[PDB]
Please model this.
Amino acid sequence: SLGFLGAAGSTMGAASMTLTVQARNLLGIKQLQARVLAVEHYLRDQQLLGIWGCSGKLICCTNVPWNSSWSNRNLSEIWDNMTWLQWDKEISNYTQIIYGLLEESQNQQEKNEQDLLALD
Amino acid sequence: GFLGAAGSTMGAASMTLTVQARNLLSGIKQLQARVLAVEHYLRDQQLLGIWGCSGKLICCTNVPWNSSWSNRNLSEIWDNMTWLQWDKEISNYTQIIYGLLEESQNQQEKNEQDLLAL
Amino acid sequence: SLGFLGAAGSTMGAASMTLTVQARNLLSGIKQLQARVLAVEHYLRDQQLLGIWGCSGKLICCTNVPWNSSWSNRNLSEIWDNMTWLQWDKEISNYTQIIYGLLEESQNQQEKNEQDLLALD
Amino acid sequence: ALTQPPSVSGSPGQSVTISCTGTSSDIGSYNYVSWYQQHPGKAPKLMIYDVTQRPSGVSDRFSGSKSGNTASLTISGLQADDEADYYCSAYAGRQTFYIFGGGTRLTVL
Amino acid sequence: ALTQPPSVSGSPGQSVTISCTGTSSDIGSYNYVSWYQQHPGKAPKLMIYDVTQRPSGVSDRFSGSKSGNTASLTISGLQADDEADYYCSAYAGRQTFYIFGGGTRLTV
Amino acid sequence: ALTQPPSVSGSPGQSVTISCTGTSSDIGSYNYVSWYQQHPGKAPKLMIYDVTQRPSGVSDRFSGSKSGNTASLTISGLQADDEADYYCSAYAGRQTFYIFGGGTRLTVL
Amino acid sequence: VQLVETGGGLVQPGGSLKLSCRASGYTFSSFAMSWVRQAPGKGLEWVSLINDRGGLTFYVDSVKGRFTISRDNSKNTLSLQMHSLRDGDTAVYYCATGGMSSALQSSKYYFDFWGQGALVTV
Amino acid sequence: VQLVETGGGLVQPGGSLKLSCRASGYTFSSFAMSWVRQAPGKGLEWVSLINDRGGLTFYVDSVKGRFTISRDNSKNTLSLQMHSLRDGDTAVYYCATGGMSSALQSSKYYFDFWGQGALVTV
Amino acid sequence: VQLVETGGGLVQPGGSLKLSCRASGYTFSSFAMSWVRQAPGKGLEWVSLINDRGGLTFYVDSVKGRFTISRDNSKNTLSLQMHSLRDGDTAVYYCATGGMSSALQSSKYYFDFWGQGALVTVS
Ligand SMILES: *[C@@H]1O[C@H](CO)[C@@H](O)[C@H](O)[C@H]1NC(C)=O
Ligand SMILES: *[C@@H]1O[C@H](CO)[C@@H](O)[C@H](O)[C@H]1NC(C)=O
Ligand SMILES: *[C@@H]1O[C@H](CO)[C@@H](O)[C@H](O)[C@H]1NC(C)=O
Ligand SMILES: *[C@@H]1O[C@H](CO)[C@@H](O)[C@H](O)[C@H]1NC(C)=O
Ligand SMILES: *[C@@H]1O[C@H](CO)[C@@H](O)[C@H](O)[C@H]1NC(C)=O
Ligand SMILES: *[C@@H]1O[C@H](CO)[C@@H](O)[C@H](O)[C@H]1NC(C)=O
Ligand SMILES: *[C@@H]1O[C@H](CO)[C@@H](O)[C@H](O)[C@H]1NC(C)=O
Ligand SMILES: *[C@@H]1O[C@H](CO)[C@@H](O)[C@H](O)[C@H]1NC(C)=O
Ligand SMILES: *[C@@H]1O[C@H](CO)[C@@H](O)[C@H](O)[C@H]1NC(C)=O
Ligand SMILES: *[C@@H]1O[C@H](CO)[C@@H](O)[C@H](O)[C@H]1NC(C)=O
Ligand SMILES: *[C@@H]1O[C@H](CO)[C@@H](O)[C@H](O)[C@H]1NC(C)=O
Ligand SMILES: *[C@@H]1O[C@H](CO)[C@@H](O)[C@H](O)[C@H]1NC(C)=O
Model:
């Protein structure tokens, strides 16, 4: 009910309740370039979620543990006392390590599930 | 065939969903047409995704049916109606239904997030 | 580690561990937009075809279609350890449409069975 | 699974009641408790389904109901041709689909 | 868990049959049974696997069969060096992976 | 579910140990053991949580620890106000979330 | 409606017997089917349930193995193949219509059409 | 922080009480709630747990089919509806905070604050 | 293949003991591994199984809450850490190769290349 980015200045534990509002707002040569680049950004994000095994979800839990070197904070100060913009700035240039770990964890999970489903 | 089941009853037309699928994706006017088809396909796929129905053609949900939307029984709905007549009958409530579906998913993931946190 | 197509000449078993590396490289004046739209259409047709089979969101998808010995009668050791994906893909030419049709029919039956199982009180 | 009396009786023209007592997880959980009439030597036929919904082909008598975990079949206007065994069939969920009690012999005096 | 007789006997040169009886959910449901030969003081050796297969290094005197919930091993000709405790093993699904029987004394 | 002695005693100025014994699937695996003090006729007050962590409003004379599958509450001071039934509680995972022992009557002599 | 149970006769303990049921008077493929067992002196017991399309099968725990229920919608034929029959399986079996329905149909958790019955002796 | 149970007292076996608990002095919607019982002569035993949003309910197996736990965050009200009380259910029922957290807080696998308790006689 | 146990052989009741297997004659990472227990005079029983990659472990119910099986493809080493050992666990523990295979390999469901066995006695 807050609207697009209305929760942007709210805390992470409150802004996380409005993910569908943000998701629904993501979708002559210049106009086609703008539409194609919007489609490409959406598809790259969806493919990246699929690689992690999070396709079809907005809140996706994973098997990658949190490193204290990425952000040495407790859940209360992360979720109740700061916004997603401040968090995004705080963990800048740590996201590529997290993405690589998520990719490797999903590859291992897919192999383990295939082997479990291969037992008679 | 494509739209062949449009005149069939919904109980029979629901078994041809893969026939109706695949026909949604396949000088500037042709490029605009391709981009428009892709945009509509992605809008529909995102709309399914925010309902927890991604990757499925028949998706069951947790939203109960309100008798004010339609008071027909299942035999009349599925054996004596086509999808076009049904779509016409409940168009005035479609967006309301969509909103409720979205809300259910908003709750569902949170519950799953808690269940996996034990 | 091996690059985009580095596993192309490796065995099918070894190459099956590099699916994400190739998956990331499928998405990334009028003719440039035409090229981008063609890339998007090919990606979306492949994702849709996986979705029809119930494989959406997975790169390795197990199914309920048994393998027919008339398509290929090699054992798993020969297919996975002594053969590459290019040679295998050549071997199963003229059979992929039958497999795709069987996968579509199997997923339609799976969806009806799941809907009926979920209809039990 | 569920408990029934071994027999009931009554005079012609009188009303009789046959009961089935199950548990909270079957009769108390689902409103699908049908009743069947089986003449000895013949296959049973459906007398009432769900709880209170009588199928076509059955006379006005044999109406049923439920309360709590107990289902009840009321047979008013008892006829001489009703001398048959009566059975309950209760739905018990997905793991066990149907449960039956023993037969109740209806004796017409 | 898996029923196997405590011992068998026979003369050299004779055909000797050892059998194990399981249940429907393991031998009856799966075709993955195996037989092992354990000499006292030594580790067991794999003799038969799956259905009447021999691993490399095992002579062709060891065969077997499967019918219903009963599996059997046949020694086509007894030797003095065959004296050992023979064991059955069978796959029983994902909850109970393997079920073993008791030992059979060959008593050459 | 949990084994706990029925009673313990000591003199003012000393300290006591109240043990609580579970199994490997509950105390040993989750490390979520709490202790609380119940006076007869009154509601219990939380005294220890997360095995070793003391909440606010409780002085340092109450502490705890675990070893293997055994949890331990250490109480120093032993003043008259501590004559109460102490209980241990442990998280066993989902499907029977919490398991409890019996009460330990602490007698202050 | 008529259900004719062209089943078997007497078998020994440990043997196998197949029952069949021919349906007429209704659309076979539109209804779920079941087998219900009546042991003399004990009463009715449900044995197995198969969906209208034949893809889903359900059993009581006591016969969860050993029994296979099969449906042929082209010949309007229901069948039950019972292996490793026990002495406790001696009973009259009945072919019955209903008990499951489908998501697109009305609720039918009852058996409305019963067959003549067939005697299985072990 | 206060918790006051306002539920009923003496009931016959097979009856119901529908106990309730009023919370004050803290944010009700931020904490999970639970019901824990003490038989008059025995120790204290957990009965049921509900999360902070009310969507998830958990019970001990002994009461799983007869107790329902629910909450109303707009009235600061917790409810427990017992519809098949047995003679063994005689106990003091305490309303308590804690028992779980909804993934975005720290762990709360303990009972942070307890009410005074309602007496159920049956 | 010279699969050799290097584990201990004497523990008190309630203690812990670690066993390990070294392999040299075969590709260790290509085969599943397991531990099979032989109590004196009672025959053999399977105790635990680990996949070829080490990600999946399976146990009998009697040890599921006590034993941990792990492997290291580097140095070709299998390990089994047994906690809370009971008097019923006195037995010879054999290393075995196989009992499982990945979806890309042929089926095994049998044990081969057995080790010589470590003797574990619980006083
Ligand atoms: C802004 O901060 C205040 C401080 O308490 C808070 O009450 C308010 O809700 C915040 N705004 C939003 C949109 O959450
Ligand atoms: C991540 O954690 C590991 C230990 O878990 C640590 O060695 C490593 O340094 C951490 N990452 C960074 C970037 O420091
Ligand atoms: C989180 O860390 C901050 C840093 O000082 C501290 O002030 C706060 O109390 C901590 N919260 C919790 C719940 O540990
Ligand atoms: C990585 O991110 C942190 C976040 O503040 C930043 O301080 C640091 O400079 C970044 N690293 C580099 C190499 O810029
Ligand atoms: C059209 O209606 C008739 C009515 O009998 C039916 O038989 C026919 O199948 C229907 N057409 C289709 C395509 O289902
Ligand atoms: C059904 O719709 C009406 C208005 O259309 C609404 O008032 C009612 O609350 C709805 N039903 C439920 C169960 O919410
Ligand atoms: C559905 O409603 C219509 C009303 O026209 C009625 O004729 C029909 O019998 C109903 N079907 C069922 C199965 O109750
Ligand atoms: C939908 O609304 C319009 C006007 O708002 C009305 O004319 C139309 O009949 C309605 N549709 C139905 C199916 O009632
Ligand atoms: C190419 O073949 C050789 C055969 O010896 C193999 O060792 C090598 O790994 C192969 N290349 C790649 C990239 O796997
Ligand atoms: C394989 O294909 C042939 C082609 O006619 C078919 O007859 C056979 O049944 C197929 N195999 C299986 C297992 O369905
Ligand atoms: C697979 O087939 C080839 C060719 O017949 C054969 O040489 C090889 O041994 C077979 N492998 C297995 C594991 O059956
Ligand atoms: C597929 O069909 C063509 C048609 O001539 C044939 O040349 C080719 O060999 C076939 N593929 C295989 C794998 O045999």
Remarks:
- Residues 1-108 of chain E form one domain.
- DSSP finds one helix and eight strands in chain E.
- Chains E and H do not touch (no CB pair under 8 Å).
- Residues A 9-10 surround 2-acetamido-2-deoxy-beta-D-glucopyranose (ligand 1) (CB under 6 Å).
